[PDB]
Design a protein around this ligand. Structure first.
Ligand code: ZN
Ligand code: ZN
Lengths: 44, 266, 114, 65, 30, 134, 181, 391, 147, 56
DNA sequence: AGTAGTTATGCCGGTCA
DNA sequence: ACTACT
RNA sequence: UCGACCAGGCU
């Protein structure tokens, strides 16, 4: 439940889906869904 | 005295450290299993709930009531309802307990296994008594309740064995070791530099003569002398969880002779 | 939901015998006994003792598949000696040993304190 | 969520030991490691049982009817 | 020495402080 | 019911290449200086240190079918040794000239021989109990 | 954390100090020196993504500060405090993570993607989602009979309330081929 | 359902509990694991419908696949891992057990085979009894390297008239390999016979392994003290070998390799250093692991794991990467904001020097992530694209 | 599942007598296969154990937090200060025979989660039944008893 | 594409799977509950009148 | 340029006439 | 998000 | 008897 409240969407292969450097400290590096919307759904 | 000997090392009311010597591993083991799995005991196995307003659900509580240990000294003279001829059950095959709790105190009222109340006629025999080893003599906190929380149950303890359910087991853990100095080579220690330095030595190393290099590999060496320790939950006196085990296993071996017999007929 | 009743581990079901002895055709004077509603406790033990009767040329046992409490025991003996008998002895032998052990343990226990 | 009666692993009774343990902590101001050994909980299978229990029942009780 | 440096284990005290005030779902609320 | 080879060799060296219970041994004949030997041995049920007088043998019997336990407490026993194996001969190499070599496997443990006088002896048959004394 | 070299008695150093801290734990035990206090007393600052571009940050407040005048063979292998321009310092690296991941024990010892799964799996688990379950009429719900807090933890858990509302049990586990089952 | 073998016909065996149970070796064809996969089942309705199943698509027939003219099912996990162990020259088995092992093989002709060793104690060797499962007339020969009709290293494989003569039995022999013990038994004896061969080989080995046991723990991942120190320098030295190449490139003293920029040609040399480095750090530990090591033992049988694994676990993870290049400068001229601009060193572009045993550092961690997250992505694209092509 | 993307389903259950044990009498609640380690390369799993095994003995909450100063080397010291082999491994006996196990087995507690998804909520089977209306074909869904 | 080149069908069953080192390569352990749902239309023949009547 | 056509398999809450 | 055709 | 659309989750 905690995890669901700190969840992000990214309406829309390659650039967006990847883990950026600027993502350090703001978004979680490991927690993202597999397949389909991978890296498109992020967690604070 | 005769065949496979014993030499009880320490021994109390709950454990019986001892050295089974001059026995076959097969046997040492079978006994071990039998002590765990098939010795008959008495335990709650039917809970008619009349009233419950605790925070626990009926079956949650019913579950516990089953693991709560009960007296089984004279279990040998109670029948498995499955064999008794009554429709369902009787004093000839069961023990009925009662539980009634109400939160009178404004401060969390505690239901203990000491609050179980036998109702069926025990026909005079050690049986169905909520085994308590607790310091305060309450043993096993069944559950807690608030203000006007009530709990009215009825139990029906029956005879049983581990195989049917664990709640019926009387052993609960059983130490077992042999050949503390890997003389039989029944193992092959893993290590980094030195097996010996890295792998702790056992308390049992003492009671057996160390290896000593020179000597070749004694392959002829079989394996007797087992350092066991039978602990007990209580339902039965530690010594019993050993004799009865020794006996149960025996009767089993017997039933095979018996079986071969009726099978002789044709 | 598809779990068999626990008691099926030990109660002989509608018309089954503990033993069922069938003559192994592969080799001469050897048989296979099916122990119903039984497990290693009995198997390995009767297997071991059976492995003392020097007139027992072969003796092993397997638990077909875990789901089922039952095992097969194959015994082969020198000519003239019947295996069924071999089984008998190995059994008594076991019982006898257990008896001594019961007594002896009881002795040591009486000669105790605590 | 109430102390488990007996440990999953070996089955040794442990239903009683709850209250005793909670004391050897609060009152007899001991450390878990010892409080456990005091109650006769030898191997980790029994230790882990008590050491880890989370007596939720308490927050449950604290509700009302 | 209410002005000495601050090692590892220390940071936690601060982190505790953060959550004491903000809480795991600040964002959604604020 | 007869032997097929006999001789005493001397352990050149014993080697346990990553093998806690087995070593491969090689020794020369104290007779024909053509007779070489390589043999894997369970150095746990019969230890062997370099430089030893071992008596090797062969033969197809001990005076087959389903194996029997002892009972032989009092039975025939070509067992006059301290290590008897059983295996099969797989290759009969011709180390050119007139020097022949035979290969034997004892359920894993291998062996090689050389020389050339077992011309009507060292049969290519599966039979072959190996024996060693001293 | 703000590192301003404002140390007329040495090098560059963290504004917050052992007193500031021991002053916080003072208020902790009392359950007045909040977070906002650490903030307004210009001790820590809110760095958005953009601003992050123009700053230098140290990991361990410690290590990445004192001078250099042996090393443990078991510990990993950290780089260094090759700098003096340190404007800020990381409260604690472990905070790069998020709720899910923050429960994974020793994540810094698993192959990156492993951590991603356990992150989406812990969400399928069973536990005690709330203590008022007894009073909720939610369609479908699973409560674990006897929840246990994990033997191995994360300082991060404490804030996630994991030890109070666990979702799993510590089982004695053996890693072995047995019946081949 | 990708190929014929995703739909094979099996014989029913009604049983307790709620899960379809299948034989481990028919595992590969379907591509099922037990993480919770579900499987469908269709019951034929006509007398001919079933004939078509039993005659055309029964699992035994499907054994040797036409996709790649070789068998498509082998021996795996426990059975594979264990069959190796039961084989090693060192492995000896005594009467009591050999007897059970024999009995377990459903066809065993009730003929106790002669102990390879009679001498003091009658012992049987793994290779021996395992051969009881191997039917007659099966002739096999291999030769790996130091193989030589007396294979000192117990290499290759020589089986005659269905009896193991020499060589350890592992994947190359009993896996779904081309010249496979399986590829042969199928062809030589028939789908039927070979079908029951998985059956026996498993029942025997499986049994043996049950009693011999097998496991694995962190203890299996730590490399020897010096062999560790030795690794650190192998990384250190490769670190300087790169440091130099860097300064030598800051003085404009580099020969831009034809068709490449100075920078392009720079990285190329750089990267080849760290990997070339890592791989050695690895081969170092891999060789320092004795044969008692379980993780090694699995890699030997070929049941699970490989070099790289032992590597990143005990030696050095390696250089993370994205779209080829090492970690980029998402931040103006740097990887993270814990670095000073224009830093090209390895501890900044994404070289994870630490092993998994040791534990990545906050940077190593985030870079590894970045790297991983890329796999997961195309793995999720590679799939839908793969799929459409297939259709 | 464990907390290392290490999912799996039960495949059979055994009772204490059949389960392998350690001379101390302890027995496992689970038995996972060595093979699901090598390739997964999820060492943390292996450590959470060594760590939690100590923490069980010591009664001190084990810290497996992200980047600390803890090491397999340290933990092994403590597990040794408790009498057990340093790396977890313990001698064990095969419950059927009682004999020892040639191998030693990694043993010790490990947090395991019981996730939703139980077979008896999935197991489905049909042989003729509800049919759609437009299509005249089998309806969809285990719930609806489809095919 | 979804009604003709493929469709939902009668006499089918599905559940979680788990290996069993005791079945023959080509068998398939089927849960009793499923065995009792899925059926086969056998025709009454003097060859099976008895067996079939027994089942009925 | 403008102009359309695809995109893995299968399985398991909440509004609308 | 990618790709070809009118 | 029983459907559509949307969205979300597992492999
Ligand atoms: Zn009655
Ligand atoms: Zn316990």
């Amino acid at each position: 439940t905690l995890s669901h409240l700190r969840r992000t969407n990214t309406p829309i292969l390659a650039k967006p889906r990847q883990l950026h450097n600027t993502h350090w400290g703001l978004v979680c590096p490991a927690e993202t869904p597999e397949g389909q919307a991978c890296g498109l759904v992020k967690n604070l | 005295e005769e065949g496979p000997q014993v030499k009880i090392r320490e021994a109390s009311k709950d454990n019986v450290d001892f050295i089974l010597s001059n026995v076959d591993l097969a046997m040492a083991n079978s006994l071990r299993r039998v002590m765990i799995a098939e010795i008959p005991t008495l335990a709650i196995d039917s809970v008619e709930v009349e009233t419950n307003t605790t925070v626990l659900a009926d079956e949650f509580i019913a579950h516990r009531l089953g693991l709560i240990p009960l007296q089984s000294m004279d279990i040998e003279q109670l029948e498995y309802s499955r064999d008794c001829f009554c429709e369902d059950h009787c004093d000839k095959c069961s023990v009925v307990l009662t539980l009634q709790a109400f939160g009178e105190s404004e401060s969390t009222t505690n239901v203990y296994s000491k609050d179980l109340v036998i109702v069926s006629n025990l026909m005079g025999r050690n049986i169905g008594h909520p085994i308590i080893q607790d310091k305060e003599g309450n043993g096993v906190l069944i559950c807690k309740l608030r203000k006007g929380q009530e709990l009215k149950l009825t139990c029906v303890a029956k005879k049983g064995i581990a195989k049917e359910h664990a709640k019926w087991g009387p052993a609960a853990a059983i130490e077992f070791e042999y050949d503390p100095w890997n003389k039989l080579k029944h193992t092959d220690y893993w290590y980094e530099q030195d097996s010996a330095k890295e792998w702790p030595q056992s308390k049992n190393c003492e009671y057996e003569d160390p290896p000593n290099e020179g000597d070749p590999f004694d392959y002829k060496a079989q394996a007797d002398t087992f350092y066991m320790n039978v602990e007990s939950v209580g339902s039965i006196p530690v010594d019993q969880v050993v004799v009865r085990g020794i006996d149960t296993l025996q009767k089993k071996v017997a039933s095979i002779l018996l079986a071969l017999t009726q099978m002789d007929q044709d | 939901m598809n779990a068999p009743d626990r008691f099926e581990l030990f109660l002989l079901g509608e018309g089954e015998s503990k033993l069922k002895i069938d003559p192994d055709t592969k080799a001469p004077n050897a048989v296979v006994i099916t122990f119903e509603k039984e497990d290693h406790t009995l198997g390995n033990l009767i297997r071991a003792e059976l492995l003392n009767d020097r007139k027992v040329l072969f003796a092993a046992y397997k638990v077909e598949h875990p789901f089922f409490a039952r095992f097969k025991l194959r015994i082969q003996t020198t000519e003239g000696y019947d295996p069924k008998d071999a089984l008998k002895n190995a059994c008594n032998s076991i019982i006898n040993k257990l008896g001594a052990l019961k007594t002896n343990f009881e002795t040591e226990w009486n000669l105790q304190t605590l | 969520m109430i102390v488990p009666v007996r440990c999953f692993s070996c089955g040794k009774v442990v239903g009683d030991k709850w209250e005793s343990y909670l004391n050897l902590l609060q009152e007899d101001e001991l450390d878990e490691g010892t409080a456990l050994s005091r109650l006769g909980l030898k191997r980790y299978c029994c230790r882990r049982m008590i050491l880890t229990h989370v007596d939720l029942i308490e927050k449950f009780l604290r509700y009302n009817p | 020495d209410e002005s000495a440096p601050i090692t590892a284990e220390d940071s936690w005290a601060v982190i505790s402080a953060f959550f004491r005030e903000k809480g795991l779902v600040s964002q959604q609320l604020d | 019911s007869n032997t097929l080879f006999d001789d005493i060799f001397q352990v050149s060296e014993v080697d346990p290449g990553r093998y806690n219970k087995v070593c491969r041994i090689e020794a020369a004949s104290t007779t024909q200086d053509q007779c070489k030997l390589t043999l894997d041995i369970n150095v746990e049920l019969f230890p062997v240190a370099a430089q030893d007088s071992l008596t090797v043998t062969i033969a197809s019997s001990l005076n087959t079918r389903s194996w029997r336990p002892p009972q032989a407490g009092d039975r025939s026993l070509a067992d006059d040794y301290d290590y008897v194996m059983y295996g099969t001969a797989y290759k009969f190499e011709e180390v050119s000239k007139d020097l022949i070599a035979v290969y034997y496997s004892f359920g894993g443990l291998l062996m090689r021989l050389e020389g050339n006088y077992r011309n009507l002896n060292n049969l290519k048959q599966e039979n072959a109990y190996l024996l060693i004394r001293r | 954390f703000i590192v301003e070299d404002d140390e007329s008695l040495g090098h560059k150093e963290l504004k917050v100090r052992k007193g500031h801290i021991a002053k916080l734990m003072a208020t902790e035990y009392q359950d007045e020196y909040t977070w906002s206090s650490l903030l307004n007393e210009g001790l820590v600052e809110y760095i958005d993504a953009e601003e992050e571009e123009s700053i230098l940050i140290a990991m361990q407040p410690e290590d990445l500060e004192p001078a250099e005048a042996d090393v443990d063979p078991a510990k990993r292998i950290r780089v260094s405090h090759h700098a003096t321009t340190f404007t800020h310092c990381e409260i604690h690296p472990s905070m790069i993570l998020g709720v899910a991941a923050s429960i994974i024990p020793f994540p810094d010892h698993n192959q990156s993607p492993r951590n991603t799964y356990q992150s989406a799996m812990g969400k399928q688990a069973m536990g005690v989602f709330l203590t008022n379950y007894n009073v909720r009429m939610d369609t479908m719900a699973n409560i674990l009979y006897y929840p246990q807090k994990p033997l191995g933890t994360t300082r991060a858990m404490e804030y996630l309330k994991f030890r109070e509302l666990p979702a799993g049990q510590n089982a004695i586990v053996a890693i072995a081929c047995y019946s081949g089952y | 359902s990708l190929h014929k073998m995703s739909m094979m016909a099996h014989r029913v065996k009604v049983i307790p509990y709620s899960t379809f149970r299948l034989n481990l070796s028919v595992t590969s064809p379907y591509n099922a694991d037990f993480d919770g996969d579900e499987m469908n089942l269709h019951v034929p309705q006509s007398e001919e419908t079933r004939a078509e199943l039993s005659q055309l698509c029964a699992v035994p027939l499907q054994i040797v696949s036409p996709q790649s003219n070789k068998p498509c099912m082998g021996i795996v996990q426990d059975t594979l891992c264990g069959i190796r162990k039961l084989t090693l020259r060192d492995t000896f088995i005594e009467l009591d057990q050999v007897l059970n092992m024999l009995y377990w093989v459903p066809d065993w002709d009730g003929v106790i085979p002669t102990p390879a060793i009679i001498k003091p104690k009658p012992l049987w060797s793994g290779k021996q009894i395992l051969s009881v499962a191997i039917p007659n007339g099966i002739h096999l020969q291999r030769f790996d390297e130091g193989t030589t009709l007396l294979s000192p290293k117990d290499n290759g494989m020589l089986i005659i008239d269905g009896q193991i003569i020499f060589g350890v039995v592992e994947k190359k022999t009993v896996g779904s390999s081309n010249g496979g013990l399986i590829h042969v038994v199928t062809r030589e004896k028939g789908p039927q016979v070979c079908a029951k061969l998985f059956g026996n080989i498993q029942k025997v080995v499986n049994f043996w392994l049950l009693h011999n046991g097998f496991s694995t723990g962190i203890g299996d991942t730590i490399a020897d003290g010096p062999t560790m120190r030795e690794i650190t320098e192998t990384i250190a030295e490769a670190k300087k070998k790169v440091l130099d190449v860097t300064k030598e490139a800051q003085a404009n003293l580099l020969t831009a390799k034809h068709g490449m920029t100075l920078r392009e040609s720079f990285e190329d040399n750089v990267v080849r250093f760290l990997n070339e480095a890592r791989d050695k750090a690895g081969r170092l530990a891999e060789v320092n692991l004795k044969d008692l090591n379980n993780v090694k033992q699995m890699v030997m049988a070929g049941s699970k794991g490989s070099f790289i694994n032992i590597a990143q676990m005990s030696a050095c993870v390696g250089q993370q990467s994205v779209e080829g290049k090492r970690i980029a400068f998402g931040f103006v001229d740097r990887t993270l904001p814990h670095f000073s601009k224009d830093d090209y060193s390895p501890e900044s572009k994404g070289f994870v020097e630490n092993s998994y045993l040791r534990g990545l550092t906050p940077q190593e961690f985030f870079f590894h992530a970045m790297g991983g997250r890329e796999g997961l992505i195309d793995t999720a694209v590679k799939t839908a694209e793969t799929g459409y092509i297939q259709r | 599942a464990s907390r290392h993307g290490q999912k799996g389903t039960i495949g059979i259950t055994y009772r204490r007598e059949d389960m392998p044990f350690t001379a101390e009498g302890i027995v496992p609640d689970l038995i996972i296969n060595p093979h699901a380690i090598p390739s997964r390369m999820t060492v943390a799993h292996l450590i959470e154990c060594l760590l939690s095994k100590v923490a069980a003995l010591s009664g001190n909450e084990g810290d497996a937090s992200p980047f600390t100063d803890i090491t397999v080397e340290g933990i092994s010291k403590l597990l040794r200060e408790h009498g057990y082999q340093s790396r977890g491994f313990e001698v064990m006996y095969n419950g059927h025979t009682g004999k020892k196990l040639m191998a030693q087995i990694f043993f010790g507690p490990t947090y395991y989660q019981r996730l939703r998804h139980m077979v008896d909520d999935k197991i489905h089977a049909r042989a003729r039944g509800p049919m759609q209306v437009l299509t005249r074909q089998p309806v969809e869904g285990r719930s609806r008893d489809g095919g | 594409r979804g009604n003709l080149m493929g469709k939902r069908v009668d006499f089918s069953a599905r559940t979680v799977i788990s290996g069993d080192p005791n079945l023959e390569l080509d068998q398939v352990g089927v849960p009793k509950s499923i065995a009792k749902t899925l059926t086969y239309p056998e025709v009454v023949t003097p060859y099976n009148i008895d067996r079939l009547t027994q089942l009925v």
